[PDB]
Structure formats: C-alpha cells, structure tokens
Design a protein around this ligand. Structure first.
Ligand code: CLA
Ligand code: CLA
Ligand code: LMG
Ligand code: BCR
Ligand code: BCR
Ligand code: HTG
Ligand code: HTG
Ligand code: HTG
Ligand code: HTG
Ligand code: CA
Ligand code: CA
Lengths: 168, 56, 97, 244, 56
C-alpha cells in the first residue's frame, strides 16, 4: 500500500512509470516479499532465512503483467497459510484473465492463449519486457510472493524452502 | 572401492550376489544361498546364537 | 530449451478452435449438429491438410456436408501432436466433469 | 478337444500363443488376385535382453539377460491387419488393431528395473519378393512405432505432467529452475522399433503359421527425464492368414 | 572411467621422449623427459629465465 502510494505521488508529480518505480527504495520493496514473512517457516527448517530462498542481491523491479489486449493483469498473492498456491491473474476488478492451468485439455486462460506479457519498472530489469510464455510464467510464479528479487543460492547451498526469522 | 571383507569372501569362493551379479562381471549367475548376502546373514545369526550361549 | 508441447500448442489456433487433427472429440458438443456422428467421422478420417478437406470424407449425406460448411469457421488444423493423439486420447482424454 | 475359459483361467496358458504340430511343414498358396488378412497375430516374448551401457565406449556393449517382474502379462495378441500382395510378389502386413502393446518391467543383475512398452504398434512388415506360397522359408521384417511408455496425463510423484500437472517443483518454491528443467518439462517420446518374424511351421490347409521373432526397441525414458535403454525381445509367434 | 590411451611424446625433431616416472617416495615430482638413452630433452621449468628445455 505504501509502495503504491509513493509510486502514485511520483506519477502525479509527473514522473514516468520507470522513474516512479525507480524511486522505490530496494529496502521497501524487500519488506513486500513473502520470503520475509515470519509465518512462512518450518519447525525443522533450521538456520538463517538466507539458507532458504538465498542471500538477497537486488530487486528485479516491479513486474507489470498485460494480456494481448494491453489490459493490466494482477497476480493473486499467496496467503501465509499456503505452502503452494496456484498462479491466477485478474483484471483490476478481480475478474480472472489468465492462469497456469493444471489440466490443459479445457484450458481457457493459459498465458499462451491470452498473450500475457511482463514489463519491469525499477530495479535490475527496469525498461525490459518479456513476451515468451516460459519466462512470463516464471515471473508470474515469483509475483505470487510479492516483489521479485535476485538471490545468491550458491554461497550457502540454499535449498529453496522458506524459513522463519528471529521474530518467529 | 575401500572394500575390506568382500575380498576375503571372494578369496574362498563367494563371488556372487542374490541380486544376480558376480565379482568377475557376470550376469544371471545363481550363487545359491552362499552369496555375499547369505554369508553376511549366516554371521549375524551366528552372532545371536553365540550371545545367547554366553548368557547361559 | 525443453518445451512442453501442449502448452506451446495452446498458443496456436489449437487454443482457439476445434483442431480437426488434435482436439479431443467431446469438443464437438460445442456446436449444433456435430456430435456424435460427424465428430466420429472427423476424428476417424484425420489428419487434414486444410479445414475444407473435412468436406471430402466418404459417405457423407448432403445435410452432413451442409452442417460441416456452417461450422468450418469453428475448425482449424495444425500439425498432428503425438502427445494429444496417442493413448486413444482423442476419444477419451481422462477428463469427465 | 477345445478349452473353455474355466479350463484356462489362472494356468498361464492365456499368456501363451497357439502352437502348431511338428507335422505342420506345409505351404500356404498365395493367389495374387486374392485379398488377404491376418485375422490373428500373437507374439509371446520368452526373453528380454537389455543392452548394458559401458563407461568404456571402447568395446561394444552386449545385450544381457534380465528377470521379468510383471508376471504373465507380456504377450501381444488378437492383432489384425491387411496382408497385401505387392507387385513383386512380396507380402506386406499392415497392422491395424489389437492388443498390440504391453508395459513390461524386467530387472537387471544388481536391481536396476527397466520398464518398456513392448509393442508392434503400426507394424508394417514385408517378406522377400515372389512369395507364391508361405512356407517355412518365409520371413517378415519390418518396423513399428514406440510411443512414450507413459501417455500425456501421467503425473509424476510430485504432481508434474505433460497434458496435466504442475509445471514446476512446487516443494522448492525458491529453487533455481534451470537445474530442474529436465524433470519439470515432460516430453513425449516417439521412436521406431524393428522386428523379424521367422516362420518355422505352416499348416497349408488352415492358413496358420508359427515361428520365432526377435524385435529391437527402446525402453521407457520417463517422459524425458532419462535416457532409454536398448532392448531386444525374443519369442514365439502365431498368425492365421485368411482370404478376406 | 576409461583408459585415455598410451601417450607418446616427441620433440620438434621427431625423437620419441620418455617422461621420468614418480617413485612412490615422492608426494610431488618434477616433469622431465629424456631420450631413449636417458639424456634430458625437455622439462617443465621452475625458474624460466635460463630455461633451455621448455616444451615451447
Ligand atoms: C530462546 C531460545 C532460542 C531461540 C529462539 C533461538 C533462535 C535462533 N537461533 Mg539460537 N541457540 C540457543 C537458543 C535459541 N536460539 C541456544 C540455547 C544455543 C546453544 C545450543 C543456540 C545456538 C545456535 C546456533 C549454533 C545457531 C543458532 C541459530 C538460530 C536461528 C535458527 C533457529 C533454528 O533453526 O532452530 C531449530 C529449532 C528446532 C529444530 C526445534 C528443536 C525442538 C526440540 C528438538 C524439541 C525436543 C523435544 C523433547 C526432547 C521432548 C521431551 C518429551 C518428554 C518431556 C516426554 C534462530 C534465529 C542458527 C543461526 O542461524 O545462527 C546465525 C545457528 O547456526 N542458535
Ligand atoms: C562356523 C564356521 C565359519 C565359516 C565357514 C566362516 C567363513 C568365513 N568367514 Mg567367519 N567367523 C566365524 C565362523 C565362520 N566363518 C566365527 C566363529 C567368527 C568369530 C571369531 C567369524 C568371524 C569372521 C571375521 C572377522 C571375518 C570372517 C570372514 C569369513 C570369510 C573368509 C574366512 C577367512 O578368510 O578365514 C581366514 C582364517 C584363517 C587364515 C585361520 C587362521 C588359523 C590360525 C593360523 C591357526 C593358529 C592356531 C592353530 C591351532 C595352529 C595349529 C594348527 C595345526 C593344524 C598344525 C568366510 C566367508 C571374513 C569376511 O569376509 O567377513 C564377511 C572376515 O573378515 N569371519
Ligand atoms: C551437554 C551436551 C548438549 C546436548 C546437545 C544434544 C543435541 C540435541 C539436539 C537438538 C536438535 C535440534 C537441532 C536440529 C538439528 C539442527 O541442525 O539445528 C541446527 C541449528 C542451526 O541451523 C544451521 O544453521 C547453519 C548456518 O548457521 C546452516 O544454515 C545449517 O543449514 C542449519 O542447519 O542449530 C540451532 O538452531 C540450535 C538452536 C535452536 C533453538 C530453537 C528454540 C526452540 C526450542 C524450544 C523447544 C522446547 C520443547 C520442549 C518440549 C518438552
Ligand atoms: C572405532 C575404531 C576402531 C575399533 C572398532 C571396533 C573394535 C569396532 C567394533 C565393532 C563391533 C564389535 C560390531 C558388532 C556388531 C554386531 C552385530 C550387528 C550383531 C547383531 C546380532 C543380531 C542381530 C542377533 C540376532 C539374534 C539373536 C540375538 C538371538 C538368535 C537369533 C537372532 C539371529 C535373530 C579401530 C581400533 C579399528 C580404530 C578406528 C576406530
Ligand atoms: C553344522 C553346519 C554348519 C555350521 C554350523 C554351526 C557353526 C553351528 C553353530 C551353532 C551354535 C553357535 C549354536 C548355539 C546355540 C545356543 C543356545 C541353544 C543357547 C541357548 C540359551 C539359553 C537357553 C539361555 C537362556 C537364558 C537367557 C537367554 C537369559 C538369562 C537366563 C537364561 C540363562 C535362562 C554350516 C552352517 C557351516 C553348514 C554345514 C552344517
Ligand atoms: C526461467 C528463468 C527466467 C525467469 C527468472 C525466474 C524468476 S526470478 C529468479 O528466481 C530464482 C528463484 O526461483 C532466484 O534464485 C533467482 O535469483 C532469480 O533470478
Ligand atoms: C534361513 C535361510 C534359509 C534359506 C535357504 C535357501 C536355500 S537355496 C539353495 O541352496 C543350496 C546351498 O547353497 C544350493 O545348492 C541350491 O542350488 C539353492 O537353490
Ligand atoms: C531370513 C530370511 C531371508 C532369507 C532370504 C533367502 C534368499 S534365498 C536365495 O535367493 C536368491 C534370489 O533372491 C537365489 O539366487 C538363491 O538361489 C537363493 O538361495
Ligand atoms: C541378510 C539379508 C540381507 C538383505 C539383502 C538385500 C538383497 S541383496 C542386494 O540387492 C540389491 C538390489 O538388487 C543389489 O543392488 C545389491 O548388490 C545386493 O547386495
Ligand atoms: Ca544447490
Ligand atoms: Ca524358417
């Protein structure tokens, strides 16, 4: 909500979309990521949070998804209860516009059918747009966790699975 | 492979596994009871019988 | 790059129409007059180089041809995808309600 | 004379092909003006051999024996198709339908299990030219299709599949995807196999023939997760030829 | 995994050269190639500045 406030203030004062998102501190974007939510851990998942998703290196920027018609689509975020969550994108009114189907035979909303693209504003990927379905799906999968980050998973041999923080 | 007892079984004629291989590289050999596993089993059973005798 | 061939097929006309070369047979329930009689003839005589070739199936009645002409705009053809046609999957693709 | 289901059930005989008497050494005339079919082709595998895969790459790998673990469930039967008489007097069998595949698992020395789709799907097999009768010197050689051992709906133990299933390793939500692409992106294999049918017995009067076969094909590749093995299957066959 | 094959070394003149093998006593060992008569023909130098026998 605060990030969106700041971006709207930036735009109101006449910034471009790239500039508005580029003004968001990486520190603020990082609090808007479920990997830092203390209710995402496991009792026997031991150690630092870095051991799970990895050591955070940089914000990738804010991902904006659009369908072939150019309407903005919003990835539904994962609530803390859920260890896994589907990938569902809706328009600004909550209507479903695209998803990653499980069964394909009667799929209506696949990213391939809806021509879903993603463009990044701010962070490492600022100004870039990806239109290839595997890459767009990859980013949509990360957008369920909120803001998207680059991680170093090699240094600690991180395993990819969320741990809680000292608050938890 | 750091095998220390396997060679002693092989030296006196235990060369096959119940699972079908042999140390000389054959397939489909049937070693009978006295495969490496049966030797290991016989020693485990021996151990138990010895332990019980010790108690007595 | 490794590709999921079904997802990829969804970004072609297969994802927009009944693909006479690939689509499972229950899809013909969508339009008046196609199922089960024509649906069976169509799957049975597939693949087709173009949609119009569906008009060339032997034994068709005049009424059947006319039903086919009225529905060509709902049909497409794309290359046969082994993953969609093996397994008898065009007849039963493991989906019920 | 003839066995009922109750005579056969649970004996193992249902997985066996019909045999012909040692007396059956006749010749079955082919009238090139007549059309023919195979009304029943049966293949009963008696040995599965798998080509070992060396580190050596020096010296050729051998085909080794294996132990069947899926029981008497291996034969192909009730298969039928057209037997064409070609212009050079060769015959071509064009498989049309039947129980033309069986999943089979055999186990190598040391425990490795090798599943395969033992099959003659879409078999097109031909004899030598000028076969004016089928005799104990006739053989058929040809090729068939070997589709993926699992079909496109098959879901792995983590729920991943080709036409259904997740498309990622959802238990490792923040793992780097690249190392897992081969496991995550399922692929559907379709390759060719080869078979020889060697006639050993012919009943001129009934149109029945029996012999030995040997086929070669790839085993399961687990929807592209690993390399398939080469398998050689040997056994006996029976066919009934009919004017049609 | 596999034998690479037998390596035959030769100098620019085509003479066969033989690498001096490591005796068991030595944790490390220099790389020195002699002709068939034990005369030194090539080596890997440690100091380069007055090298006479470098492979180059
Ligand atoms: C209030 C206690 C407390 C808390 C909240 C923490 C918190 C933390 N520590 Mg510290 N720590 C503590 C005390 C604590 N520590 C003590 C006393 C020591 C000396 C052993 C340490 C030594 C230590 C090291 C060396 C490290 C941490 C690290 C951490 C982090 C990971 C914790 C983890 O993975 O736990 C895992 C927790 C569990 C697996 C739960 C254990 C549950 C037990 C086994 C239950 C036993 C049941 C019992 C036997 C049943 C009896 C039944 C009978 C009555 C019938 C986390 C910030 C790690 C870190 O990231 O450091 C930078 C790290 O490397 N800690
Ligand atoms: C009941 C009979 C029996 C049999 C048939 C076996 C058989 C085997 N054992 Mg087991 N074993 C047994 C009982 C048996 N064992 C008992 C009771 C123990 C507990 C002590 C063991 C403990 C044991 C160990 C620790 C090991 C074996 C191993 C083996 C294998 C190689 C044997 C070998 O190399 O011996 C070699 C034996 C000798 C060289 C004997 C030397 C005799 C000395 C020189 C005699 C000196 C005194 C004599 C009185 C001198 C005067 C002699 C006179 C004739 C002149 C073989 C499968 C090996 C193996 O592969 O395990 C999986 C191995 O490591 N066994
Ligand atoms: C005298 C001797 C003392 C005896 C010690 C005996 C060992 C007991 C074993 C305890 C097992 C717990 C360890 C889990 C295994 C492990 O590797 O942890 C290992 C973790 C460290 O975690 C490690 O961190 C590393 C980088 O630092 C790497 O990331 C490793 O991947 C990671 O495993 O050690 C701890 O976290 C210890 C502190 C845990 C404190 C949690 C507090 C909650 C406890 C309250 C429960 C009370 C219930 C009472 C019920 C009645
Ligand atoms: C450490 C070390 C060492 C030492 C070691 C040792 C000394 C060990 C021991 C070991 C041992 C010594 C072991 C043992 C084992 C055993 C076992 C494992 C047993 C088992 C048994 C059983 C199981 C039985 C059972 C039974 C019974 C009891 C009764 C009858 C019947 C039956 C058979 C069932 C050295 C010096 C080298 C150095 C290095 C380090
Ligand atoms: C011959 C033979 C052989 C060998 C054999 C052997 C070597 C044997 C041994 C045996 C043994 C080695 C035995 C033992 C036994 C034992 C026993 C029989 C025991 C018992 C016990 C008891 C009864 C006890 C009781 C008790 C208890 C437990 C507790 C406390 C109390 C009392 C004391 C009461 C072989 C294989 C080579 C082959 C060929 C043949
Ligand atoms: C198919 C990859 C191309 C799209 C980029 C994937 C989303 S972002 C990606 O996410 C990983 C966790 O899965 C992180 O470890 C990594 O740092 C990050 O680059
Ligand atoms: C408690 C374990 C008892 C199980 C025994 C299974 C015997 S199996 C049996 O063994 C003989 C001796 O080696 C062989 O000669 C024979 O060929 C083999 O079939
Ligand atoms: C304590 C009971 C466990 C004993 C198991 C006895 C294995 S018995 C063993 O089985 C092999 C096949 O697995 C055969 O090659 C061999 O002939 C036979 O002796
Ligand atoms: C004393 C009984 C011990 C139990 C024996 C386990 C079966 S035997 C076991 O089989 C594996 C799979 O085929 C092989 O890979 C391995 O070489 C062999 O030792
Ligand atoms: Ca790793
Ligand atoms: Ca013959």
């Amino acid at each position: 909500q605060e990030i969106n406030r700041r971006v709207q203030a930036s735009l109101a004062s006449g910034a471009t979309l790239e500039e508005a998102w580029s003004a968001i501190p990486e520190k603020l974007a990082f609090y808007d990521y479920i990997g830092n939510n203390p209710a995402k851990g496991g009792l026997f998942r031991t150690g630092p949070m870095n051991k799970g998703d990895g050591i955070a290196q940089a914000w990738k920027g804010h991902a904006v998804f659009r369908n072939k018609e150019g309407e903005e689509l919003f990835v539904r975020r994962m609530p803390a209860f859920f260890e896994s969550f589907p990938v569902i994108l809706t328009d600004k009114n909550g209507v479903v516009k695209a998803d990653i189907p499980f069964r394909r035979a009667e799929s209506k909303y696949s990213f391939e059918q809806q021509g879903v693209t993603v463009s990044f504003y701010g962070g490492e990927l600022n100004g870039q747009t990806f239109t290839d379905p595997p890459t767009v799906k990859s980013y949509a999968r990360k957008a369920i966790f909120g803001e998207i980050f680059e991680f170093d998973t090699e240094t600690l041999n991180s395993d990819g699975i969320f741990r809680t923080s000292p608050r938890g | 492979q750091g095998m220390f007892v396997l060679p002693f079984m092989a030296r006196l004629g235990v060369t096959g596994s119940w699972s079908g291989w042999s140390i000389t590289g054959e397939t489909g050999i049937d070693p009978g009871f006295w495969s490496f596993e049966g030797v290991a089993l016989a020693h485990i059973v021996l151990s138990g019988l010895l332990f019980l005798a010790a108690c007595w | 790059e490794l590709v999921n061939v079904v997802d990829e097929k969804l970004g072609t006309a297969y994802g927009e129409k009944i693909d006479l070369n690939n689509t499972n047979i229950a899809a013909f329930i969508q339009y008046r007059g196609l199922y089960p009689t024509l649906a069976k003839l169509i799957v049975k005589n597939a693949p087709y180089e173009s949609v119009e070739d569906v008009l060339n199936i032997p034994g068709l009645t005049e009424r059947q041809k006319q039903i086919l002409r009225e529905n060509l705009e709902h049909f497409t053809v794309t290359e046969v995808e082994t993953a969609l046609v093996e397994g008898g999957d065009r007849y039963n693709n493991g989906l019920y309600k | 004379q003839t066995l009922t289901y109750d005579d056969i059930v649970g004996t193992g005989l249902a997985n066996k092909c019909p045999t012909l008497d040692d007396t059956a050494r006749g010749a079955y005339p082919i009238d090139s003006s007549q059309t023919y079919r195979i009304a029943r082709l049966c293949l009963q595998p008696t040995t599965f051999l798998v080509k070992e895969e060396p580190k050596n790459k020096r010296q050729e790998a051998e085909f080794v024996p294996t132990k069947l673990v899926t029981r008497e469930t291996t034969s192909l039967d009730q298969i039928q198709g057209e037997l064409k008489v070609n212009s050079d007097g060769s015959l071509t069998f064009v498989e049309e339908d039947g129980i033309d595949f069986q999943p089979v698992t055999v186990q190598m020395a040391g425990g490795e299990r090798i599943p395969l789709l033992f099959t003659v799907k879409n078999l097109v097999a031909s004899t030598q030219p000028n076969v004016t009768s089928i005799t104990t010197s006739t053989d058929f050689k040809g090729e068939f299709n070997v589709p993926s051992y699992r079909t496109a709906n098959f879901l792995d133990p983590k729920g991943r599949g080709l036409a259904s299933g997740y498309d990622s390793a959802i238990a490792l939500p923040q793992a780097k995807e690249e190392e897992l692409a081969r496991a995550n992106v399922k692929r559907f294999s379709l390759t060719k196999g080869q078979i020889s049918l060697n006639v050993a017995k012919v009943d001129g009067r009934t149109g029945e023939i029996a012999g030995t076969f040997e086929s070669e094909q790839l085993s399961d590749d687990d929807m592209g997760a690993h390399e398939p093995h080469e398998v050689k299957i040997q056994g006996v066959f029976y066919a009934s030829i009919e004017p049609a």
